[PDB]
Amino acid sequence: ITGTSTVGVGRGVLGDQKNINTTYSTYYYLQDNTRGNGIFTYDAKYRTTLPGSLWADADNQFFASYDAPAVDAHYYAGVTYDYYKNVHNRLSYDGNNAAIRSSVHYSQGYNNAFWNGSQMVYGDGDGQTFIPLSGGIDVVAHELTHAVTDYTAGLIYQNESGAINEAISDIFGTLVEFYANKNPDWEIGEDVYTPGISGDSLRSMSDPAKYGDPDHYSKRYTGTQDNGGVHINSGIINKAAYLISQGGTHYGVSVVGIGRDKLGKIFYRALTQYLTPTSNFSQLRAAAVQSATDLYGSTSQEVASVKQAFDAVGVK
Ligand SMILES: N[C@@H](CCCC[NH3+])C(=O)O
Ligand SMILES: [Ca+2]
Ligand SMILES: [Ca+2]
Ligand SMILES: [Ca+2]
Ligand SMILES: [Ca+2]
Ligand SMILES: [Zn+2]
């Protein structure tokens, strides 16, 4: 809508207060004009039609329980936009300031979130497996990172290319979580998964095997479930990324950590300059090595650590 840019206040899924950029035209809409072509948040109203209605509020205060998923989808889309712009000089997911659209209250009891090729979509969860999924900054950033991938490497969502696609979303989801710097970790979805169980998550990057996922290429899944294991085999790449950043010894192979900022630079460059729709794990290794070489030099610690990490997870 056309209107006056303003600032509302609300509470997110976890009960935390935050300011949100809104637009006033009769109602206060969840439309943030301060970032690119805008960030727009919609109410799917428990239906599956998308996007639904641009979120309208009478008083610019978003403290109702029903408001909470919208507040977080809107706010965390803004944080993710800021990460890509400030850290990587990327303007929105297409690099041309495309409008970011999100819908909340998708379906009833829907235990997932996704990028549908055009926008973000968040279920409310069933209250036992998940609470509303936009409460997880890593979840929001994971899904928006699929949009970045769509416009860059375009990794096909099946088998090894698909597992790279997934790992890229977990990596940048996590780096956005660290950027915002509120309870950051190397776990995925911990803020919204299983409200009745403390200390668990959907996936772990530091120890993928904790949730049944492979941490070495020898343990890769080659069945047909989950588009050939895209959320399973992502563990192999997540583990490599974790090792590059944090270091460690894994199956007896030692990796010197280079930190999360350099991890982000290396993987962003690989994603945007070297990866292609059909890239496999071996080709990801080559892309990461080339990226680290460009940024830091062939004799650098950074290049050595990329090689060690991929060696540690059995990817040559
Ligand atoms: N995003 C993961 C799991 C999230 C919710 C599981 N019910 C997947 O789609 O496989
Ligand atoms: Ca209100
Ligand atoms: Ca966290
Ligand atoms: Ca996390
Ligand atoms: Ca939990
Ligand atoms: Zn994903």
Author numbering: 1 to 316
From the publication, what sentences describe this entry?
Here, an automated procedure is described to identify the positions of many cryocooled crystals mounted on the same sample holder, to rapidly predict and rank their relative diffraction strengths and to collect partial X-ray diffraction data sets from as many of the crystals as desired. Subsequent hierarchical cluster analysis then allows the best combination of partial data sets, optimizing the quality of the final data set obtained. To demonstrate the general applicability of the workflow described here, we have applied it to various systems and scenarios in which many crystals of the same type are mounted on the same cryocooled sample holder. In all of the cases presented our workflow has yielded data sets that are fit for purpose.
In order to demonstrate the possibilities of the workflow presented here to produce data suitable for experimental phasing techniques that exploit anomalous scattering, two different systems were investigated. The first of these, thermolysin, contains one catalytic Zn2+ ion and three Ca2+ ions per protein chain (316 residues), producing a theoretical anomalous diffraction ratio (〈ΔF/F〉) of ∼2% for data collected at the peak of the Zn K absorption edge. Bacillus thermoproteolyticus thermolysin (Sigma–Aldrich catalogue No. T0331) was dissolved to 100 mg ml−1 in 45% DMSO, 0.05 M MES pH 6.0. The reservoir contained 35% saturated ammonium sulfate, whereas the drops were composed of the protein solution and a solution consisting of 0.05 M MES pH 6.0, 1 M NaCl, 45% DMSO in a 1:1 ratio. Rod-shaped crystals of between 40 × 40 × 150 and 40 × 40 × 300 µm in size were quick-soaked in 6 M trimethylamine N-oxide for cryoprotection before mounting on a sample support. Diffraction data were collected using an X-ray beam of 10 µm in diameter with a flux of 4.0 × 1010 photons s−1 at the peak of the Zn K absorption edge (λ = 1.256 Å) on beamline ID23-1 of the ESRF. Our experiments with crystals of thermolysin reveal other features of the developed pipeline. The workflow thus ensures that partial data sets are collected from only well diffracting areas of any given crystal. The collection of data of sufficiently high quality for the structure solution of both systems is thus clearly challenging, even from single crystals. Nevertheless, as can be seen in Figs. 6 and 7, for both systems our multi-crystal workflow clearly yields diffraction data of sufficient quality for structure solution.
